[model samples]
Every structure is written in structure tokens, then in C-alpha cells.
Target: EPEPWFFKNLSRKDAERQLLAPGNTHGSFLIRESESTAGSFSLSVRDFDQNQGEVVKHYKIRNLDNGGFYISPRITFPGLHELVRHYTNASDGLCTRLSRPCQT
Candidate 1:
């Protein structure tokens, strides 16, 4: 069976070790040819929120000059509450699962 999303199969530091450690393809494969340039890669994490019942679950495909050079999913919610609402609503209003809560 497939592992759960909230499951701790990997560490953030371990994931970072592959991306920000340099000599990785996560960025190259994701970035556009026109975006290829020097001193063009920098990012981070921070304050978060809760997903309410109806929030804008935004998504995008960024092409930045960084990482291991690959295209990846760029999804986000207006708030933590909204994000939870999205899944819960889909689950027939069964329940809200805010497994790993992130604080702003």
C-alpha cells in the first residue's frame, strides 16, 4: 500500500539536503530555457494558516533557476482552514483533518 501523506517517511532536512545542497536537477528540469541565468535561485518557508470550508486552493508551475531541475507541483491555499475545508468538503463533510498544522 502507498504511504500516507502525513506519514513521516522523510525528513525536511533530508529533502533539503538534496535540493539546496547544490548540484541538483530539481531546478533545471522545472525552469524554462529563458529563465536560465546566474544568481537566480532563492526561496524559503514560513508563517502558515488554517483551511476553512471554502478557500482558494491555488496552484502553479514555477520555473526558477534552482533545485534539481524538474517540474513539480506548486499548490497553496488561501488559509489553513480553507485548505482543510477543501478536502473535507470533498469527503462528504465527514471531518476536517488538520494532521500537521503549521503556525504562522
Candidate 2:
């Protein structure tokens, strides 16, 4: 089965809609296939600011020639799960640390 947070074919617009849905707080996130880039993926996350209210941020998940994955060139993972685990533990350079998967 696919991971709970992984959405194979979600569009960027829908991803944002889901993340902004009620009950989703800051840091709720999901991984979706890239719309324009074949074989690539994106990380969509929710963030809240006092003045801005709710906002969503997207990050590109790039692939390495050797079959690894990375959101930042400085950090890489053997798989998407590992990459998710890393950001869940710390925001790193992300807008916020991952809190939970967006409900399907």
C-alpha cells in the first residue's frame, strides 16, 4: 500500500485545498507527483502566520542519478519515506516541521 501521506496524482491546487481544510493545522503535509516534471515529486505543507493566516508552501523533491532523493542538495535519502522521516523530526529548511499527513 502507498504511504498515508503519499498522493500519487494530486494536482498542486487540490493539494493546497486539502492542506487548508479544517482541522489541518500548521505543518500538515503531503507528497504528490509533480505536475510538469515526469518522475519527480513535490512536498506541500501548511503554515500559519498571525498576519497572513494560512499559507501553503511547495518544495521540489529532486532525484539523483544514482537513485537517491533530496529536497536540498546538501541532504539526500535512499527513499521518500526516509526523506519524510527526516523532515518530520525537524523543519530543516522547510516552512515548518511535518505534523501529520493530510487526511485522504
Candidate 3:
């Protein structure tokens, strides 16, 4: 049987590896803000469609305190560098979609 998912202090570096790997449906990055123990997180999601090409999307949940977490869809990025660049893009080039948290 499948189990519920969870996250805790999962650094981006490690999550990225899982994101780029095949069969890894989801990866998460948590950012603890500066000067205070508060921050947000982002998720990389992969989905496939027969009509449209395979694509990836990002999601964000913010201002979560300690022990705060979420579960969402996941994906794989053959070109990991491009996925990273999506977030680092200039002028509204951010990759994530502002979402109201993930659901079961």
C-alpha cells in the first residue's frame, strides 16, 4: 500500500537530484527566511499528455512555520539545467505558480 508523503528540511540540492531522476514524481524545496524562522517552499511537478507534449510546472506555498508541510504532484526534467533556469529567469521569469497548497 502507498503511504502518505511528508517533507522536513529538504534542501534544494538534494531535491533537485530527485527532480531530474526518472519515476520521481515530486520534489520540494524549503526556504527558511532570514532573521526569522519563517519562509516558503516550492514544488516541481511533471505531467504527461498524449495530445500535448510532456511538461513541468512549479508550485509555491509561503509563510509556513516549523512542521508545516504539503503534498503535491511530481515530475522529471531531462534537462535539469533548463528547469533551474526557469526560476532564475529575468523579469517575471520565475517558474512557480502561486497555489493554495496541494490536495489529496
Candidate 4:
């Protein structure tokens, strides 16, 4: 089975809907293949505010020359699993720290 947070073919529209659905809170996140880029991926996270309520944020996960991955140029990971683990510990430059994976 695939990682709980990984959705190989999820689209941006559906990613946002799933993250914003009932029960999901700020920091819930998922990774999906980038619809526009052949091998790139996207990080989608649930966010919230009193005025705006629930919102979803997206970040590009680009591939490195050496086969690593990164959302921010400064922090790279050997794989997507490592990337998720790092963000789970800290948001770093993300909109918020990742809490739980988006429910299937």
C-alpha cells in the first residue's frame, strides 16, 4: 500500500476539498503528483483563520539534480517520506506544521 499521506494521482481541486472537509483541522496535509509537471509533486495543507475559516495551501515539491526532493531550496530530503517527516516535526517555511495526513 502507498503511504497514508501520499496520493499519486490526486488533483489540486480534490486535494483542497479533501483537506477542507469536516474533521480536518489546520496542519492536515497530503502529497500529490503535480498535474502540470511530469514528475514533480505538490504539498497541500489545511489552514484556518477566524475571518477566512478554512483554507488550503499548496507548495511545489521539486526534484533535485541528485534525485533528492525539496519544497524550499535550503531544506532537501532523500525521499518524500523524509520530507513529510521533517515537516511533521516543524513547519519551517510552511504555512503551518503538518499534523495528520488527509483522510482518504
Candidate 5:
């Protein structure tokens, strides 16, 4: 079979380890926090390989929230700066539901 679905079929341990708090969660979407009014939130992401070696990974503050649920998708194509502008209206442009950031 093509390399088995590791993240899907293999053990979860291969994904994440180490925690400041013990909870039922998955991988290392870790972010360092600083004192703030809104408090700090994170949106880490990763990429992996099955047949080849580990691929390059990039992590940025995906979104910021205190303690709430945000239904967002991973933007795989490269356009975050434009995305921020498009959503935050940096260019005074109108945004459709599909082209805006989720409510933070």
C-alpha cells in the first residue's frame, strides 16, 4: 500500500509530546504567552512526510482569542499578507464571506 496513513493509522504519540497541563488533546500547536488584556492565543500548524524525510514547517499566530471556538480553515496557498489586508480592509476593499477573516 502507499505509505499508510500514519497520522491517521499510526500511534498518536508520533505527533505530540510534552505539556504544561495534562489534558485530552493532540499535537504541539504550542505558543508562548505574554500577559495581555485579550490574553494570548495561537494557531500553529505543521507538515510531515511518510516516505521522504520531514518537510519544512511554518508556524505563525494563526489567530488570536482568549477562550472561544473559531471555525477556520487552513490557508494552504501563500497569501497571508493579502489575506490580512483583504479581511481587515487595509485597502478599503469590500470582502465577501469567503474572503474575510473569521470573527475574532
Candidate 6:
């Protein structure tokens, strides 16, 4: 759970703790080589645990052919509703599910 907005003030230590708190990764990863324009990209798991126990759902290996490669996945939607729809269903349709009262 998140801190309520009513707790509008926090100490620097508290703020830092929130910023560096142990939490799941919620977005994509872009790894480019420091020497060359080639590397891998990944979409890290959100419901992750400590000690790198997260499941990597998406990954692209770079430098397959020639001497260069680009690896990344397009993140068009990061909204909560979009995330749920994409994860629960195949994203073909969700409005029907949304309209239902007791969607399982």
C-alpha cells in the first residue's frame, strides 16, 4: 500500500527510503553496449522478490547478425487498466469484461 496523501510531509530519510525502497520493477529495460550500439533489452517483472527472483517476461538479445543489434520492446501503454487487461486477457477485448459486474 502507498502512503496516504494526507501524510504530505516526510523527512529526507523517509523520502530517500521511499525512493530506494525494495520494490518490484515496473517497466522496460534498455541495455546498450558502452563501446558499441548493441546490447540487450528486457521487461522486468513487477511482482518481484528480493535476491533477483523476479520473472523476466520479455527479453531481446542483441548482436545476432552483423556486428550490431538493437533490442527493445515498445511500451505503448503503462496505465493500470491497460496493464490488467493485457495481463489477464490477450488484449483482443476487455470492454466486455469491464462492463460485467463480477468479472473473474
- Go through the candidates in order and give each one's C-alpha lDDT: 0.27, 0.92, 0.36, 0.91, 0.27, 0.29
Ranking by TM-score: 2, 4, 3, 6, 5, 1
Clashing pairs in 4: none
Candidate 4 TM-score to native: 0.93
Candidate 3 residue 5 Cα shift, in angstroms, is: 3.2
TM-score of 1: 0.18
lDDT of candidate 4 over 4-101, digit per residue (tens): 99987889999998998887888999999999888899999998776988899999999998679999899999999999999999889788899999
Predict model 4's lDDT versus the native. 0.91
Deviating ranges (above 4 Å) for candidate 3? 1-3, 25-37, 47-57, 64-104
Error of 3 at 81 (Å): 30
Candidate 6: tens digits of C-alpha lDDT, residues 37-97: 2333222222234666433332232443444333222333432234334533542322111
lDDT of 1 by residue, 1-104 (tens): 22122112323343333333334321111111122333322221121235432221111223333432211333334432344444434422222222322211
lDDT winner between 2 and 3, please give it.
2
Could you give candidate 5's per-residue lDDT for residues 22-50 as a string of tens digits? 34122222222212313322322222356
**Candidate closer to the true structure by TM-score (higher is better), 2 or 5:** 2
Question: Which candidate wins on lDDT?
Answer: 2
Candidate 1 Cα errors over 4 Å, as ranges? 1-75, 91-104
Residue 85 Cα positional deviation in candidate 5, in Å, after optimal superposition: 31
- Which candidate would rank higher by lDDT, 1 or 6? 6
Listed per model in order, the count of residue pairs whose N, CA or C atoms clash below 3 Å is 24, 0, 5, 0, 0, 0
Error of 2 at 77 (Å): 0.3
lDDT score for candidate 3 against the true structure: 0.36
Worst 10 residues of 3 by lDDT: 27-36
